[PDB]
Amino acid sequence: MEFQAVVMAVPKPLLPVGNKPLIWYPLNLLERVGFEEVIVVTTRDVQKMKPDIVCIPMGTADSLRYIYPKLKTDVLVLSCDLITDVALHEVVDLFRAYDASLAMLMRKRDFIGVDSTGKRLLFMANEADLDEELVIKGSILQKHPRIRFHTGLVDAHLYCLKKYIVDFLMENGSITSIRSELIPYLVRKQFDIYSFIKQVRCYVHIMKEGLCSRVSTLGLYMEANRQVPKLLSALC
Amino acid sequence: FLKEAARKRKFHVIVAECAPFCQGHEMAVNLSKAGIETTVMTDAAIFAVMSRVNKVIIGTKTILANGALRAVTGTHTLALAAKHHSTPLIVCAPMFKLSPQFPNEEDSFHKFVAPEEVLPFTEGDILEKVSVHCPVFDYVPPELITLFISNIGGNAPSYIYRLMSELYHPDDHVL
Amino acid sequence: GSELSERIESFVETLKRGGGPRSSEEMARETLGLLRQIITDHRWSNAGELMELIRREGRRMTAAQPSETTVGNMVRRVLKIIREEYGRLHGSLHKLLEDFSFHYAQLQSNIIEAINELLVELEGTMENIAAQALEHIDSNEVIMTIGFSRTVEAFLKEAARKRKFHVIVAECAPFCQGHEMAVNLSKAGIETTVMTDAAIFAVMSRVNKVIIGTKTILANGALRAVTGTHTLALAAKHHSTPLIVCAPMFKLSPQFPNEEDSFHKFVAPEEVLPFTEGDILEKVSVHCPVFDYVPPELITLFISNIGGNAPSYIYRLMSELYHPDDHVL
Amino acid sequence: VPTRKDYGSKVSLFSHLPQYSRQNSLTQFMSIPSSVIHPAMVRLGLQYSQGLVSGSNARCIALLRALQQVIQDYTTPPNEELSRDLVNKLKPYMSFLTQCRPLSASMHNAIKFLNKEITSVGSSKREEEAKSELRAAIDRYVQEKIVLAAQAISRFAYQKISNGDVILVYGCSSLVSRILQEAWTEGRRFRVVVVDSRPWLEGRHTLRSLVHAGVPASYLLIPAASYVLPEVSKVLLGAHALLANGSVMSRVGTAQLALVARAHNVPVLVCCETYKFCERVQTDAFVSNELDDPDDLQCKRGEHVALANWQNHASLRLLNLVYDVTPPELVDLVITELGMIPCSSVPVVLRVK
Amino acid sequence: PPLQAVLVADSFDRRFFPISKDQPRVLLPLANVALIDYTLEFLTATGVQETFVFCCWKAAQIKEHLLKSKWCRPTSLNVVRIITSELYRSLGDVLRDVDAKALVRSDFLLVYGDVISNINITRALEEHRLRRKLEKNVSVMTMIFKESSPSHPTRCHEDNVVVAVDSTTNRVLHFQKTQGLRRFAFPLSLFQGSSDGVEVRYDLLDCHISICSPQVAQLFTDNFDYQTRDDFVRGLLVNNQIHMHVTAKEYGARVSNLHMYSAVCADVIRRWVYPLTPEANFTDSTTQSCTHSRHNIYRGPEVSLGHGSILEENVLLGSGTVIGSNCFITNSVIGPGCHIGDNVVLDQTYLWQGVRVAAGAQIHQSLLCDNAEVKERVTLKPRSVLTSQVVVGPNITLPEGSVISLHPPDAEED
């Protein structure tokens, strides 16, 4: 079809958030809107739509290349810890209209630069790589003289990716943990990946109203456990 | 053409009677019988009322070769008023009303009937002096026409010559 | 006193820099008040010296802004008033088959009285024009206008209390002022509509009447209206629809289309093409004319405070309003 | 797929035409992996609704490429012929595309040609061969009616443009821009006057394209066209469709421009392809037209918008016309790949195809 | 509080190094009219009630030109005051002297004597005052910027700047030029307090118009090594707050070098600085009257245009200028008292008063100052500037970028 579903879980993914399985929330984000097939990459102990479950005897990029022969069309990566009240169409419309190569979703130490219209991704960097200051090129400003900076947003770890990007992940085994190596590289490349295109663009979606909380600690765990009930009241 | 669209649209129809034979009254009655909000009037008030009109749809007796018509008396003035106000004048006529002749002839174009309809016989002795003429039809040039709605679709008057070439043979024009 | 000088300089500067009074009525009132003031506090004895002083000051005010002809009209009206009052106190082909150096005493008081009478008439012109709305508007009528004019606004909203019609408003591309008029009309429940100039001819087949406002009326019955009125008049003439012009008497200038090129007021191209385009602004030549010329042949009637008249009689109004020697000013 | 709901209060004279809003898209109520609608058609409808592809030929080219993709991605089911299956399957896609944005004459003609070609496929031929033949027919049609026709019209119009001329164009038409660029490259030395209108402001596209080409150009809005025509020597216009009665259906600001040009005694020319020649007839733009988003009429003048909240006034209406019709009495010449023909020869060319 | 301004009629930088030897930068005729006239008209039109004119270089000429001008008349609402001194070497010394004399009281404007603009500052000044009354001595300066495109000819590299401002409330967090530099650096201090409405702006034209406060002059006395305004802003930003105001429907620009000069000239002739145009005659002079015609062609009195010559685009003819036969002039500004020959092509050329051009000359993109003269069969290339009272012999072809002046070492000699 158009998109393929993949939910990576590389216990933590089995924590009962809201007395329900933690991996049940991403699948619900995938379910109710087509998605008759889903591919899950989990540990050996993690086991119970139509889930295609594979074990991991390792980073996100390695798992994606590990399931490369499986994928056949554009991918939509989802995380194990993901409870959100967003409409998936909001990010897929951006991926569909501008024929973009990368589409991400975030919610209000990691600096991001968005253009005037507010959805073009122009700059992406971490605080650790920068030495002391923030360096910006002249060409990006000649094309886009206005760059709105965000620092406080959170990364939901969900991306609408193309197929040749996965082919590129297969080619170069240097990128690991795409969330910190592939997305910044693509953002720095829109201004090699140019061999599998047969111009690169990256887009973003900001909700500013939601429960887009990615569970990665005990505090966020309790916060999600407390906020899930008003959402489960409408979902089910 | 008018009563086929009244089932899905609502409009106002103005009907101008014909002075010699007031045949527009029957049309107005038949249209009002279907609920179209029709009105009847004289020819003298054609131009006076043709400032609020938006479209004109009429029928002809025959279509000449250069796209002109032989219509009932009063259509030439209607076309003149339409051209003065720049209003489209539609002519709904089938293909059998198309004659392969140009305005060659003279005087025998119109059909002249007894003057009884114009001036009655009970006037008096003035009928020996007064000369009365009663033309039934008139000539409408093509320049005042805008469109021709036929069974094969609407067309412009500047293409009627082709319909002639398509319908009749050049050797059978004189008959 | 120098206060008169300070006022004259401020008036000339405000007219030359930007626009002054927003409404034409306020402009005429301000001009007449300044003229009355110049007559009141000044050293003048004879009519020729006063007329030359007023002529020099009016020439300055006109040179400040040539497109602002309401001030030239008021100056010429005051000059005609002075000449008439002087002839009242001192004493063409049919005619054909003058010093102002005599000094009277009550000339100033009656000049001021005449100016006040002109002011009151200037104030009543709006109601006098708006009172003739029902004579030309009917029920279930469609009216088309362009721009924003107080006279046309009053003429339209004065008849909505007794008649119901549909009003179409065409905005002005450089300064979209028709939106305010459309909003003000819809606030009174007139069933107004807003549209662009590109769809003027496309919609001008279902229109029944046109009522518009002008900035000034020329001598042969032509107008200096906002940009877009020439096309409106052309469409009206193509569809043979009457085009009414609601304009008071102070919008009448005694000049024929003599001039060339300085007719229209050209403003910065920022409204047409923004400054943020790029480098193409060095090559592309942009022009932004505010006004345009409308010939008299495309006009049908003129509704004024003294009743409607045809354009072929505007010359007589000129002869009635201004003096032939004060045409050049 | 549900109905495309309307937006706002429409005008009394255009109460029969749809009025939508660009912010509210119809892809909200659909599955992310589109099952009932083809993904290519979904992306095409989204691009049409968002205004990404704005043009008669850009729209037709995008539609034809999407149809090629659909045919490549479509496999015929059993116990049924392909010649009728493809037409029946493409019908809802066309319905969805029309719901996203009313189709143009070019798209209608292209869809008619494609349906004819699909119906012409025999039941004995194989599936792969039929699909390849359809894709090749689509590509040859694009090549003949769009690229080669544009070259023939430019080659014919090059003789009409002379040195020292002052040509006046309106809106954004790729055919006019290509004609002017080729005439300038062939050695002609003239200057163009670009006329634009709100709210699309698409004339700036042709303006920048000409500046990039090196042609001296000017820019102004349509209400001042009566001011620039006295110095204009020729008026080049683009047409989206030519009806059977010779009338020209094009952007809204064309009929008024042609009217003003005739009043100033300036010969008007029209450039159009033969595949944009519609067989239907229309006398004015009221019975059939297209109403775009009314919120485009809002403008930031000064520091406040006079039409910021127009829906609060129940008596206030916002009219945003798109197309318009011009009578044949205002068009001097029509340029096509067949040759220069008058406007009262539109049906004759429709005869030959 | 009456609005008061400070006018620096001397720019302590010398880029017009040949031309500025005989005659100041601020009296160079742009459109037959000096730049200080443009600046004074802008100040008088924006609402300024009093100005303080400071001059060091060739101040006698400046003062006796202002004293003939219309702003020094008893009927002017913007009373001007000339303060002259030979010690001033930079803007910092001028502000120090203002603080020493206690001339200013309230929010005053700081503008150079070569700024051409039609911007109204009531809005920005109102914003400034309200902000200052919520923060009594915070919010000390407001720099006016005109939003443009980075492609525009008016944006020269020598003045080109990049800002890192707050989008919630306009506030300057980082400000730096981009003269000869390809990748910009922005420190991390900016993202310290709030960190949500931060934005980088590269589409801005520095109008060199700043709404200053007496405290600015105070700080100028405090910091002795503040030599300009830019250094004041950098030294305050390393550490009081400085804000901005962006305009999109008004024009404003400062003539800093020659390239900036030919950009404002083109804009002024093309009516981009309306109402300030040659047709308006905003100086109230009798020898600067003109008539605006089609294609933005300006003709003065006694133009004596010869038969055959063609004016094709935005040209400005002076009063007394004589045009010959069969000429071609375009995008060129000609001064009063000029005298052209025959078969003379002028393309983007600027002739000042007292120039004579012989027949057969072809001049393109070059500037002729007062009393210049060229003989027959002479061809000038782009950027081929002639200073005052130079004479170019016949049958000479000047190279591109050539500069001729009567002083020996500036660039060349007669």
Residue numbers in the entry:
A (entry chain I): 1 to 10, 24 to 61, 71 to 79, 84 to 134, 155 to 237, 262 to 268, 297 to 334
B (entry chain C): 177 to 351
C (entry chain D): 8 to 98, 108 to 113, 120 to 351
D (entry chain E): 167 to 519
E (entry chain A): 41 to 279, 285 to 459
Excerpt from the paper describing this PDB structure:
Crucially, for every round of cap-dependent translation initiation, eIF2 requires GDP-to-GTP exchange, catalyzed by its dedicated guanine nucleotide exchange factor (GEF), eIF2B. Molecularly, eIF2B is a large, heterodecameric complex composed of two copies each of an α, β, γ, δ, and ε subunit. The decameric holoenzyme is built from two eIF2Bβγδε tetramers and one eIF2Bα2 dimer. However, we and others recently discovered that binding of the inhibitor eIF2-P to a distinct binding site — located on the face of the eIF2B complex opposite of the substrate-binding site — allosterically switches eIF2B from its active ‘A-State’ (which can readily engage eIF2 and catalyze nucleotide exchange) to an inhibited ‘I-State’.
Here, we show that a single engineered H to D mutation in eIF2Bβ alters the conformation of the eIF2B decamer, resulting in altered dissociation kinetics of substrate eIF2, a ~ three fold reduction of intrinsic enzymatic activity, and resistance to ISRIB rescue. After 2D and 3D classification, we generated a single consensus structure of the βH160D decamer at 2.8 Å resolution with most side chains clearly resolved. In the WT decamer, βH160 forms a π–π stacking interaction with δ’F452, which is lost in the βH160D eIF2B decamer and leads to the retraction of the short loop bearing this residue. In the βH160D decamer, β’R228 repositions itself within the network of three negative charges (βE163, βD160, and δ’D450) and one aromatic amino acid (δ’F452) to reach a new stable state locally. The loop movement caused by the mutation propagates across the entire tetramer, resulting in the rocking motion observed in Figure 4B. Comparing the βH160D decamer to A-State (eIF2-bound eIF2B) and I-State (eIF2α-P-bound eIF2B) structures, we noticed that its ISRIB binding pocket was 3.3 Å wider in its long dimension than that of the A-State, again reminiscent of the I-State. The widening of the binding pocket can explain why ISRIB fails to assemble βH160D tetramers into octamers or affect GEF activity. An overlay of the βH160D decamer structure with the eIF2B-eIF2 complex structure revealed that the substrate eIF2α binding pocket was widened by 2.9 Å. As established before, a similar pocket widening is observed in the I-State structure of eIF2B (2.6 Å induced by eIF2α-P binding). This widening is predicted to prevent eIF2 from properly engaging the fourth binding site on eIF2Bδ’ and hence turns the decameric eIF2B into conjoined tetramers such that only three of the four eIF2-eIF2B binding interfaces remain readily accessible to eIF2 binding. The βH160D decamer rather represents a continuous distribution of conformations with a more restricted range of motion compared to the WT decamer, and for which the average converges to an I-State like model.
